Scaffold this active site. Structure first.
Site, short mmCIF file in Angstrom:
data_model
loop_
_atom_site.label_atom_id
_atom_site.label_comp_id
_atom_site.label_asym_id
_atom_site.label_seq_id
_atom_site.Cartn_x
_atom_site.Cartn_y
_atom_site.Cartn_z
N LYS A 200 4.91 45.17 -39.29
CA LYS A 200 6.16 45.90 -39.23
C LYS A 200 6.69 45.90 -40.62
O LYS A 200 7.02 46.94 -41.18
N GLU B 182 15.80 36.77 -40.19
CA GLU B 182 14.40 36.87 -40.52
C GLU B 182 14.05 35.63 -41.26
O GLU B 182 14.91 34.88 -41.72
N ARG B 183 12.73 35.36 -41.35
CA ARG B 183 12.21 34.09 -41.75
C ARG B 183 12.25 33.97 -43.23
O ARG B 183 12.14 34.97 -43.94
#
Lengths: 470, 83, 499, 187, 85, 50, 468
Positions: free
Chosen positions: A158, A184-185
């Protein structure tokens, strides 16, 4: 900071109720700063419970909160700073550098809340963005100022899809881009930060053509929810005041829904279907409405969406599905077939694809493609029981074209040199129309399937045939 | 603060009036809010558990919930004749 | 200066209101101000805040009245005086909303100056009585050959348009409006349908495109667009179809006819859900309020073809419900399906297969049918219904060794199906619907190769105009095909088919 | 009987007390004694603290009542029975709430209206008289019920005044007008 | 599970039916993914296992056709045989 | 052209804060006494007109 | 006069504060004065503290809290009479026929309690209709509940009309068409149709009385329309002895209406949303519908199956009350057979040998066996070939197809609709007709002779005419 001092009354979570004194009234959507060894804990006032007792949502952690702890009121929506050094630095929810490139140049400050521009203000899109990804261009052409939506799997490239877009489109257009990460990471953050330092889009000496606002998922749900609003105002500063077009990018908006769902529950507001916010529709709607092609600046959002358990009829993706101009679905199956991109072509549909709009030839070619694939899809079931052994020569030729088309779609990406190690291809819009036209005409029905596999334009399809021919 | 079965103004008026005894709340009760085929009665302190009570509503009921200062009878019969 | 003029407008506001009932917010959270005062408040009163925000009062509780803000919380705060306008919800109704885009309040969101309207009338007003309602003798034509014949629609008739999400959902609706330009031009006011499009949910950008398309086709000059956009508040969204209907009453009451398209009522439902949960009102099936049914039923029965004592007028309606996965079983679809008299059900496979409109005839029904159908068009499309039925069944027998009879069905069927395909935003006249279908019915074009159907069709129309636009005008004006007209028509078709 | 319902919040207690003591016609007396014991209670800092606090037990609550009847003797034993009721129900935090409400019921029964002339600053005696006159002149005070107005100073209203009583207000706060002016000149 | 799936940089779905099928320890390789991760294995091992995924994916498709009981061409049976081993 | 237009908008917001400065001036002035009195008598007249 | 002031209007659930000891009872009817005349609120709770929770019958369209209320003192009293025949009446017992004040002598409370065990008649009776199909394969029941299936478009409405005609011929009884959740279009059509088919003849005699409950009517009034209709029926049964036949529309909308009232009252929704008192309400309705010593009501109900699921609690609950189910098929109407009845899906619980006669039971069983064998025989007779028929097999096929035609008989109501004047066949003659055809006495009679005529006697004539 108004001398409205409140003493905390209940720490029960992120929800922290504060007890401002009598004869001193707060206002909804204010910003409270609480002096802490956590700097200023920021509380966004979200309800009044009367008697000068508010119920506010925390941004930062509530660990070690002392009962009755003095709470200064800084008032109004949190105002971040904006400038053109916003570009090229990562910025947290409360508007502070995360790349520690010192404080963003505060030419102006603006509140994170802003209101959608009016119906009168709107100026409608009618221009065609080009992605250089052939399938995307033919079967779902994107449009400048659009609201592209990257529904897709678990970071199943993605991020990669977005990386390609930044590599091609972002760099190409002179306008700014804002890359916004909702929950998000920090692993992904480090990769993206490093990667975009490498691609030079981020220039750490000299201006960057991108800005970053990375909000990560360790942050409490409240901060996760209201990072998006901040990002929107930055885009607005660009859109309006700098006038520049914004190729906005946000990640991942299911995380925006989830963050909101949690604080709906925490606010005590009964959550609607599949546990989502009661105000799910309107919160999405306000966010989406803010983002638009405005006369001052055309804003082209690319919004990642994570389809929970690959079910997009779940109310949160399905509700978002309406607001998005140019939906795209990225599916595991197509990836697994070895076709990069992983886009499901039937399901990826952009609003513009109308016959005159994309030109009659483009349309006719795409109609033929759609039919070819749809026929192939119908024939897959037939092949399943009957086998391809009693379905026409014509049908077989249509299937053969479909396998060839299927692997014509297999086009490598420069940002999947990281992955596959195969440099990408950029194919001109005119060239893509031509290349699909040829295949359908059966001009390239002597070309091997693997000589369509993982190649770009027409020249490449022929060239890899020549390579195999040798 | 919170609802209490002594909030009822007639009960409350008697308590203020320094009246709070006299078998009214022992071997008899007086019905409070009623409907849903269950009644909430004030008094009945000498009630047994799973007793049969006869209302002055031409109906009898079986006491189910013995609650502090109130009993929630279950009405074996229609609420038409109950007030 | 721009500043001086703006101040001049503010300077003219200095009137004081000795407010008979004032309230003061105790607490405002969730857009649910709970106000102390307002004892003389009538239910669903319009109330004006200190912020100037308008509200309705769904919960009247004894000590506090939990007003619902039509505005936003950003400009609302606690303690605020809450002036009581003291008038239950009313919206302007009148003539001059033709070609006007307004929000629910009645403020122009196109901002094409103050609304021209004759009165402001309440929008909670009820539906026409049984005796005040008489049969639909009127057809209406959308310019879509299949819709007009297979699912013939009338005036003062409500029929659902339940289908797959925005897959030309808006396109189907718009097509009717374009043919209504023709009818609008037509003097009789049963043919002057003053259309109302109620854009519910749909964002301002999307509606701007609609607006632009409508302006392009000059449809604005009888169109009304009640717009409750995504940004527009959920109370406004909730009351938006009710409000829209009130505008329609003026036309209906005037004996004129009009068509109101509620698109999409599914998003209206969500707004009621949002409201109810926030007001702590009981949730119900599929977490939608229990009396969501009660709302939809009230709305959809207002639409109706009135009795001839009631000035022979109507409000045609065509509600649009968006089925997210084709789930007709879903609570809001099931309810609406019962209320409505007809459904049109578009199928995704057909959309994918490039049949746009993607209408699936099987799951499309009209329950008023030939009462509201042109006689000419009825004659030449009874056959069509039967033929298509066979084609559907024998489409699945298209899969090796197959009888000549089966093959005849396939040839006729595929060609007919192709014939009923129509490019988006092409309306048609009934006088040209009748010839094309007649040809197909007589199998003249079923003889003609599938690939050549399209070219034949357009050519046939030009050929008909050349050979006998007398026939076309006669078909239009007589409205009933004489044996002589069917003879002459057959001759013309034969002559054309030979070329 | 209540001359006008004050919906609960221990104003059901005030109502009950009111109707009971109204039929015993010891409402002025009750009110006075209640105010008097409340005043000296407020001016005791342990019952201007712990009376509010829910610290007290059953037994400790009972003993607080015993101390209270040391503080004053007699004057409506219905308000002394009220003390028992309130202590037992453990609502002593809404004690003054009841008192205020009982007062409202009492002086409403007497036929006296309360009101306020909230203003940015203290107002003339000329202003007071003119307003008293104005309200009686207007049908708003039709008489049969007295008029009381308390001018209060709130600097929050940046100028002007707002008269309030009977849910009838005339609001000439300048702050609000300034707000609307600001808004149009930010357009 | 939904929450966790987002957090984690891989999913290693295991399948019980495949445990019974004899892959014990079992795995569900159709749903075994690594959202981020894609290199962190031995360089040698990167070279060798390149088309292992493709072969298995093809095996999965081929096997589905095969389970109906329909006659299989040799090309599919190359896949089937390769996959089985 | 863009900043030229922007400067006009910026000017309206500049003039907004100048209005605010004038608000403080009014509240400093015995317009605070005299116009509040004017409002008081006006409200009396209004309330008499009820 | 009892009075109270409105002290809440949270939704249409209106709390009224009444002067003490003048507190209504539950199920009383209140009339709140309004410029809408009155709004009838029915007391459905005592909330205590001199307040109630009431439900509405007439919607609240602006209400100032504190409005004076007047208590009728009990369940709404709806006009009754033989003068209330042919009057369209809204829920509040008031004319919507616009023929002015309803001609009535007495009015009577809508809530009433089912007759005692003693007043239940110990033996069941069989009603008859001109429709042979009904009297054979799902015998009509005097007292019973017969639940109609198959929507309008099969001429559902015409079937209903047929029943009114039949009731008039059969007894000269009455009917009341109660429509719950009725479309305003459908209401217009029905009134006009009823006028047209003369079952209502405004100038003339009007047997059936109409109670129409539109979907725009409040959910509470949707629940109460049925009970009003029943009261009218009971006036006929109890005070004129006459048997009645009561149509109800969707019982889904009865349930749905009840579900809403539960939710509004705050009562916990029982399974599939439906009210926790769903069963009892149906019970009251369908135990007031019974055979008393005096007379018997009989009820035709319409079951709009929810999602076509018979596993939903509401259809099951309905089926418990039902004695018979009439399952109209549109396939059958498409075979031109009016009656449109699906013969093998129409079943009654009264069909037992003792109940309907041993001969009749056996005849019915034979007709069922004939048809059952015919359908199955036609499955493989069609596939294998029609020339694969045995003498026995074609006897059955012939018999069935002749019977299928014999079933079609025009209806008096469908004089217009088929174009052919009605045919009614009495119960004795129904048994007789199938006996002879079964015994093949009249198997020398062709299919088209059987088509569109009544009983056996008729088709002797028709055979001659068909040939001629």
């Amino acid at each position: 900071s108004t001398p409205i001092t409140g003493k905390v009354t209940a720490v029960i979570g992120a929800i922290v109720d504060v007890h401002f004194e009598q004869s001193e009234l707060p206002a909804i959507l204010n910003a409270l700063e609480i002096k802490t060894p956590q700097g200023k804990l920021v509380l966004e006032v979200a309800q009044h419970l009367g008697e000068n007792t508010v119920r506010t949502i925390a941004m930062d952690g509530t660990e070690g909160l002392v009962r009755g702890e003095k709470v200064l009121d800084t008032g109004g929506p949190i105002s971040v700073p904006v400038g053109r050094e916003t570009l090229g630095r990562i910025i947290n929810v409360i508007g502070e550098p995360i790349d520690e490139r010192g404080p963003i140049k505060s030419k102006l400050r603006k509140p994170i809340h802003a209101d959608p521009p009016s119906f009168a203000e709107q100026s409608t899109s009618a221009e065609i963005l080009e992605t250089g990804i052939k399938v995307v261009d033919l079967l779902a052409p994107y449009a400048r100022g659009g609201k592209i939506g990257l529904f897709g799997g678990a970071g199943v490239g993605k991020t990669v899809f977005i990386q390609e877009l930044i590599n091609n489109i972002a760099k190409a257009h002179g306008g700014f881009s804002v890359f916004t990460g909702v929950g998000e990471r920090t692993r992904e953050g480090n990769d993206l930060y490093r990667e975009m330092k490498e691609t030079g889009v981020i220039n750490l000496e000299g201006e960057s053509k991108v800005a970053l606002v990375f909000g990560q998922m360790n942050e409490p749900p409240g901060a996760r929810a209201r990072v998006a609003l901040t990002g929107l105002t930055i885009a607005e500063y660009f859109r309006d005041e700098e006038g520049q077009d914004v190729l906005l990018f946000i990640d991942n908006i299911f995380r925006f829904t989830q963050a909101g769902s949690e604080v709906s529950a925490l606010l005590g507001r009964i959550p609607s279907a599949v546990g989502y916010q009661p105000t799910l529709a309107t919160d999405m709607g306000l966010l989406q409405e803010r983002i638009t092609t405005t006369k001052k600046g055309s804003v082209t959002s690319v919004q990642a969406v994570y389809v929970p358990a690959d079910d997009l009829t779940d109310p949160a993706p399905a509700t978002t599905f309406a607001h998005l101009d140019a939906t795209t679905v990225l599916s595991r199956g197509i990836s697994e077939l070895g076709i990069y991109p992983a886009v499901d072509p039937l399901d990826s549909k952009s609003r513009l694809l109308d016959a005159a709009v994309v030109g009659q030839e483009h349309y006719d070619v795409a109609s033929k493609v759609q039919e070819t694939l749809q026929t192939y899809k119908s024939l897959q079931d037939i092949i399943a029981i009957l086998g391809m052994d009693e379905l026409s020569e014509q049908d077989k030729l249509t299937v053969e074209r479909a396998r060839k088309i299927q692997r014509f779609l297999s086009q490598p990406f420069a940002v999947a040199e990281v992955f596959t190690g195969i440099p990408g291809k950029l194919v001109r819009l005119k060239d893509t129309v031509a290349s699909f036209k040829a295949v359908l005409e059966g001009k390239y029905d002597n070309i091997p399937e693997h000589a369509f596999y993982m190649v770009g334009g027409i020249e490449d399809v022929v060239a890899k045939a020549e390579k195999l021919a040798a | 603060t919170k609802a209490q079965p002594t909030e009822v103004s007639s009960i409350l008026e008697e308590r203020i009036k320094g009246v709070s005894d006299e078998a009214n709340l022992n071997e008899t009760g007086r019905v409070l809010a009623v409907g849903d085929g269950i009644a909430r009665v004030f008094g009945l302190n000498n009630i047994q558990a799973e007793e049969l009570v006869e209302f002055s509503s031409g109906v009898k009921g079986m006491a189910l919930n013995l609650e502090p200062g109130q009993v929630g009878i279950v009405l074996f019969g229609s609420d038409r004749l109950v007030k | 200066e721009v500043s001086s003029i703006l101040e001049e407008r503010i300077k003219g506001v200095s009137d004081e209101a000795n407010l008979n009932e004032t309230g003061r917010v105790l607490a405002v959270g969730d857009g649910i101000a709970r106000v102390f005062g307002l004892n003389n408040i009538q239910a669903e009163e319009l109330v004006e805040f200190s912020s100037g925000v308008k509200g309705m009062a769904l919960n009247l509780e004894p000590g506090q009245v939990g007003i619902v803000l039509f505005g936003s919380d950003r400009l609302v705060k606690e303690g605020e005086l809450v002036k009581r306008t003291g008038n239950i919800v009313d919206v302007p109704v009148g003539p001059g909303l033709l070609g006007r885009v307004v929000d629910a309040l009645g403020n122009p969101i196109d901002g094409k100056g103050p609304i021209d309207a004759a009165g402001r009338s309440r929008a909670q007003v009820k539906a026409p009585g049984i005796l005040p309602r008489r049969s639909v003798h009127e057809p209406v034509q959308t310019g879509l050959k299949a819709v007009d014949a297979l699912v013939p629609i009338g005036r003062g008739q409500r029929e659902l348009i339940i289908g797959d999400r925005q897959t030309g959902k808006t396109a189907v609706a718009l097509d009717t409006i374009l043919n209504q330009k023709r009818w609008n031009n037509g003097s009789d006011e049963s043919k002057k349908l003053y259309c109302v499009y109620v854009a519910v949910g749909q964002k301002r950008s999307t509606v701007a495109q609609l607006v632009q398309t409508l302006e392009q086709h000059d449809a604005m000059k009888y169109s009304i667009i009640v717009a409750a956009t995504a940004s527009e508040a959920a109370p406004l969204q909730y009351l938006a179809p009710f409000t829209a209907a009130s505008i329609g009453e003026w036309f209906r009451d005037n004996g004129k006819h009009a068509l109101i398209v509620y698109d999409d009522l599914s998003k209206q439902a969500v707004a009621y859900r949002q409201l109810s949960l926030l007001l702590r009102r009981p949730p119900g099936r599929e977490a939608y309020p229990g009396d969501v049914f009660y709302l939809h039923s009230r709305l959809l029965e207002r639409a109706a073809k009135l009795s001839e004592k009631e000035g022979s007028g109507s409000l045609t309606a065509l509600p649009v419900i968006e089925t997210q996965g084709g789930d007709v079983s879903a609570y809001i679809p099931t309810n609406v399906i019962s209320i409505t008299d007809g459904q049109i059900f578009l199928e995704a496979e057909l959309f994918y297969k490039g049949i746009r409109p993607a209408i699936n005839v099987g799951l499309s029904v009209s329950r008023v049918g030939s009462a509201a159908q042109v006689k000419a068009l009825k004659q030449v499309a009874g056959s069509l219904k039967l033929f298509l039925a066979q084609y559907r069944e024998v489409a699945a027998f298209a899969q090796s060794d197959l009888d000549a009879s089966t093959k005849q069905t396939l040839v006729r069927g595929e060609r007919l199906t192709q014939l009923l395909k129509q490019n988006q935003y092409s309306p048609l006249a009934t006088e040209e619907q009748v010839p094309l279908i007649y040809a197909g019915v007589n199998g003249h074009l079923d003889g003609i190769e599938l690939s050549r159907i399209g070219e034949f069709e357009s050519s046939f129309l030009s050929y008909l105009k050349s050979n006998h636009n007398e026939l076309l005008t006669e078909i239009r004006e007589k409205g009933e095909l004489s044996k002589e007209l069917l003879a002459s028509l057959k001759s013309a078709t034969e002559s054309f088919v030979a070329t | 009987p209540p001359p006008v319902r004050l919906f609960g919040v221990e104003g059901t207690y005030a109502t009950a007390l009111y109707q009971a003591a109204a039929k015993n016609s010891s409402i002025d007396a009750a009110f006075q004694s209640l105010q008097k014991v409340e005043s000296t209670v407020k001016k005791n800092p342990k019952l201007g603290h712990l009376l509010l606090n829910p610290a007290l037990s059953l037994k400790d609550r009972n003993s607080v009542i015993d101390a209270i009847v040391e503080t004053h003797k007699n004057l409506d034993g219905y308000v002394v029975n009220l003390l028992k009721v309130l202590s037992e129900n453990n609502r002593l935090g809404c004690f003054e709430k009841i008192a205020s409400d009982f007062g409202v019921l009492n002086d409403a029964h007497n036929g006296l209206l309360k009101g306020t002339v909230t203003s940015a600053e203290p107002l003339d005696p000329k202003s007071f008289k003119r307003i008293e006159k104005a309200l009686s002149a207007s049908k708003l005070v039709g008489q049969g019920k007295s008029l009381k107005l308390e001018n209060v100073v709130k600097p929050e209203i940046k100028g002007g005044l707002i008269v309030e009583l009977g849910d009838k207000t005339v609001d000439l706060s300048i702050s609000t007008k300034i707000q609307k002016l600001n808004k149009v000149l930010e357009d | 599970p939904t929450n966790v799936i987002s957090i984690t940089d891989g999913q290693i779905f295991l399948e019980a039916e495949l445990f019974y099928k004899g892959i014990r320890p079992a795995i569900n390789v159709g749903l075994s993914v690594s959202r981020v991760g894609s290199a962190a294995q031995v360089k040698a091992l990167k070279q060798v296992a390149g088309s292992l995924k493709l072969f298995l994916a093809q095996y999965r498709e081929v096997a589905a056709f095969a389970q109906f009981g329909s006659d299989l061409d040799a090309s599919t049976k190359q896949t089937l045989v390769r996959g089985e081993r | 052209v863009r900043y030229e237009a922007s400067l006009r908008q910026l000017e309206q917001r500049q003039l907004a804060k100048s209005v605010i400065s004038r608000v403080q001036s009014e509240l400093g002035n015995p317009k605070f006494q005299e116009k509040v009195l004017q409002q008081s008598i006006s409200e009396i007249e209004q309330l008499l007109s009820k």
